[PDB]
RNA sequence: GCAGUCAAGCGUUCAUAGCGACAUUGCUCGGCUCUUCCUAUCAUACCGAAGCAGAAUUCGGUAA
RNA sequence: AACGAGAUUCCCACUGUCCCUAUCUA
RNA sequence: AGAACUGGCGAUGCGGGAUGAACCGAACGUAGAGUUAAGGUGCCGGAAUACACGCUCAUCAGACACCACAAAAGGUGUUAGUUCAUCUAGACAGCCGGACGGUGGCCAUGGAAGUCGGAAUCCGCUAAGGAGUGUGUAACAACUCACCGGCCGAAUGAACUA
């Protein structure tokens, strides 16, 4: 649901049982992931998510109001070495994800930092409240 | 998710087949040919060069 | 098939006939006809959609 | 298709014998069934 | 739930429904065991076969109670339509027995498996299996009727149509045969038969439209005369936030009396007097003014063959439910027409280049030939882009030649000085 | 694993055999159905991508490339073969009465030992008006439902220090057996290039023997690598020229240089003849021989329908790594060292 | 989907051009399908089958003949009943172990005279055969002459037991 | 399951020496990991029935 | 009330314990 | 399950039952010849791909055995029967036609005319037609068969048993 086009395979930085902050200006600082939505299954292996793809997480760090619920959220930075189609290899400073409804429509109103091009990409309305692109 | 077996896809696959699918492989085959026989030709010349 | 003929209804709406000597041949030929026109996954009552034999008969009429 | 598997005609010796007990078996109640 | 209940799990049988669920319990359960085994894994094969049975009818008869609407829970127009189009206590008698045999059933599962830890034997065991099953089947059977009237119940409130009491309505009634049913017909998309006979509509059709931006909803009604067809309609009227549309046919039509429909309306006008009526025309004359006593009336008389005053009585009831610096354009867009999807003679778009072409997924559209150049001889773009080491964009300019001649004087005012030795 | 790829022994040889080919049309012009070379190098490559419908539609990517080395195949005999109950039966070859030192090679395990003398007396079977030559042509044209060319590798031309040409088996798909035993006859001691097989944009299966790792500890332990393997569906992206200059000029780039890096390949040369720059990863390791076969069947998706546009080649140095495209870009960064000046 | 959408769609449109061909054939071939049926399926299906044909068979006989005739015009692992004196009973039942799982109180008892089943409680464990042990332990096994309550109400105080409620569920009496 | 209601016939003649099927009516030691196999299949493939408007679904068939 | 390498739980930091192994040396 | 009596094994080789504790045969010195027992005679395998009358086609037939278990049955497989039925006053099948008026019988109810349902279910007229066998319409109509009758000309029908 929400995500625009096709999905193609970037490198996975963020398994389940990690802390990436919070981007947007809704009042949490921080997200711990519990599940990632649509994610391959090996024994043993952890579902482990990447850039712009929407994770199960809580707030760990935040207002109440934002908390007592789990709810999905995107991922915006994420600071493993991931390839780009464009030459390059690049990575962030720190994880970060956005949270958002089911449909993909954003709670907040903007997003600090850099925004992932991937991520941007798929997500419409992650660009919409997008400040930083790349 | 249909098979790589799948009857139906294979019959959709031979209606591709009759079409610009194996007359692009036509074409290509006789400019392949074609430098093949531009490739005698070469080597006849270089035959001449010592006949001379 | 070999030895079936296939004409268009001429001042009938909708028609397509289909005429020779084996009755192999032109009913087969028939039943293919309509079997290539499935109603795939949806209902019978409501979907009138296909090809369907409306009269078996002769070419000489006596 | 996959060919599943086919019941065997061997009886074995243990099959045959104990075959041969149950029908002696239905004699003696055939006989007793018989008086009543 | 709300409005409407198509979404319902099917109801079996009684007998199929056993069919389903003893089925079930042989194919996902092990079957096979010996005399000769532990009395321990005896116990477990049986004890394991009379609960999935059990979660078996358990499941079945859960997905019958809750699929159900809850009918004194719901709606009072729909706690009472259902009272109409079925005997609302013989509804509410079946999902009891549902919930009575679900219980049952629970209660037989419960005791065998207690009466199961203590069989001796595979024979009494087995015979307590058997017991177990059989019982609830015996439950099941007990059945035949009540699930008998849930399908039917089932599929015709499945396919029954979705009023919204609290959006703007409009019923339209008067006798049978008035000619409301053309008022529906001429006012939206829904097709109602107008067939020359009194009770043709049998239950309450639905028409959507929208005017001054907003959605209405006027029912077609199947008119009044008791009976659960008739008092599908008073109901309709009764609990609706609504406005009435008595319909009236002054002429030889309807075969029925003007004088019986002013009898009607004045012995109706108890439950609609709350509802403020509009009155539709389709000693004699003065009898018009009978049904004008009313306080709350409007007379107007209109053609359904005529398409404009139809839409005038729409209108008029819409209206008593509401109360109830310059910019800069381009002379090439101001002179230029319209796009009609129906002309065989204009401009021929991407989307049809592409069907032209061929396929969607398959057409490259080219960049080129889109774009405004000094010659269209060099519209097939190369640009280098990258020249040893050095890309080309960086370097690129005009007037790079006089630029480069400024350099060559740089060069001769360096050449004869003797830095080249 | 996949019990498919057993038994997981050593291979017969590092020159896997074709298994199967390309099936025949009666109709279709003269032309090879496969050619060998010499896998060695791998490089980037950057292209536009007018693949239509992708999230990559009017876009750039980057992808890797291999560069297999292929010298003119210099063709030395033809086989027939008779269709039987038994399978094919191969009735008579055929040589070309003057080979090489290469092939000549090829028949001793130790060459310098030997007095050399291989076909002298087939040679001399030739030395008339042909009479028993035309004869098991004769015997091949009348016969034999599918004819195979025997060629062999120009081994020299190749930076390999191995001297020693491999004998190869390739069929033909140009119909009327007659003018494929002719075509044979045509081409007796003459050369077939690269690019008289292959183009761009054409899909190939490169069969290879897998870079052999030993031994190794139902999953059980044993053999690893040396096993010959098919892969299937490699686009080729640029047949090359040896004579040419700036083989690594694009369309883009435009600069005279040779796709060979700075200081070569690892472990192997340069390019000194024809190549192929397949897409993707062949099979093997560098230095490994491998035969390009094409494609068994009409493979047409849009994945094999759509022209390569290449744009840029990588040809930094493998060995370390890339900063500089020729050496004259390394220098020219750089500017002037010690022992220049 | 306004109330008969498909019947008003019949009603207008038909069913298929083809709807009585296929109906009329299909009713032709089921006369062989049923004994194409019957030949196949085997395993389980077979004998559900064989059980459905029988009961269509009989049910059928039934129509006809009716027609035709209105034509004319240590532990115990058995189940035991224990008195309400529980608590503290056994003098001389030093560790003879009844579990509660297997104490039924109320016999599926009907009437000989009147075909009516009354589900009664049971007051008193009277003669059992096979073991006078039993009678003293309340053992009702088949034979067991049992004392029938009428709180709820001609009729007969005891009833003898008939099923062996160690194999099936309850207890069933007959009265005597 | 117990008791009754039918009831094809057979009972040594045969319904009043009796047995009697399907129905029906009475109330009520556990768990970690791998290999192979079975189908009594949860999903994927193709079908049949279903108030199956579409979507979604329920039952059933072939199918390891 | 500090303790005692007492025990448990939580918060913060850390790590190949693991996701998921990879390489080198003895 | 308990007795009695009886065989066999046990202290017993050999022929056969493909194989073997109790199954069929069998009076063990060493040899030769003939004849047999049980079991057999397609080839393995010694001995008839004998002869004669039949029955069976099995989507894993069957060769098996006090004919014992799933076993009572289902089947438009096939062959024999038995008991009642029709039949050149024309059998079954087949189309062609009639298939009626009282009468839209009474209650039912918006509308139910045989065919949503509740009770009798009657008369007349015939060659024969039911207060109606199903399809059908809102209700009718129309068609259908059960009942006759017209050409058609020899067998056919039902219920059981093996």
Redesign the interface.
Known sequence: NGAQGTKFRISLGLPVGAIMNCADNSGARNLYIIAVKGSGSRLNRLPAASLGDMVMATVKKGKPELRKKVMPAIVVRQAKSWRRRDGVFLYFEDNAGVIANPKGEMKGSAITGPVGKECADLWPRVASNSGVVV | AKSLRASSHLNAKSVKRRGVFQKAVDAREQRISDKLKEDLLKQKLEDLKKKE | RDGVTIEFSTNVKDEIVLSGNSVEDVSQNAADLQQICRVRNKDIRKFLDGIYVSHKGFITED | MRVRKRQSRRTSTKLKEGIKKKASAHRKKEKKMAKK | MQLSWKDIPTVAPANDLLDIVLNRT?RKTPTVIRPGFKITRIRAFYMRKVKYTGEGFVEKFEDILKGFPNINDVHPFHRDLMDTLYEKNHYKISLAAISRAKSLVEQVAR??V??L????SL??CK??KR??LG?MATIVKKLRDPLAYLEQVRQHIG???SIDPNTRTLLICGYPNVGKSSFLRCITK??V?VQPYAFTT??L??GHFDYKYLRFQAIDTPGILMNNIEMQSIYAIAHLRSCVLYFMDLSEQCGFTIEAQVKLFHSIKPLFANKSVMVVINERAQLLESVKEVPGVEIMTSSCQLEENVMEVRNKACEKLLASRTPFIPESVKNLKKYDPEDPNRRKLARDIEAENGG??????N?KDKYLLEDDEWKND????????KNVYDFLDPEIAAKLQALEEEEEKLENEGFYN | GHLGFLPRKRAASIRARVKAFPKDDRSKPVALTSFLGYKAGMTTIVRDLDRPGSKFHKREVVEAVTVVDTPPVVVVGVVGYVETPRGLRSLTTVWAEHLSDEVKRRFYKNWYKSKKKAFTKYSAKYAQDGAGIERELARIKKYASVVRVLVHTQIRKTPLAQKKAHLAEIQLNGGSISEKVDWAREHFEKTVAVDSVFEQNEMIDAIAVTKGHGFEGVARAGQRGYHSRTSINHKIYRVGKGDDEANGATSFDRTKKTITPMGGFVHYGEIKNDFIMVKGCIPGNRKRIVTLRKSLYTNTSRKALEEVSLKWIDTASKFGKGRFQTPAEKHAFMGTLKKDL | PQNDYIERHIKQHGKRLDHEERKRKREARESHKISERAQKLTGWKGKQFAKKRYAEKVSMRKKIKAHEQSKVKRMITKHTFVGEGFTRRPVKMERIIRPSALRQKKANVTHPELGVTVFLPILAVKKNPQSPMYTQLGVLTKGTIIEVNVSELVWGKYAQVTNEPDRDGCVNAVLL
């Open positions: 042989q005791d065998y207690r009466l830890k203590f069989g001796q024979f009494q015979q307590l017991a177990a019982r396919r029954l149509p829904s097709d038969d049998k239950s059709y639905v969607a997924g398959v057409f490259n559209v960049l190369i640009m280098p882009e990258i020249l040893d080491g």
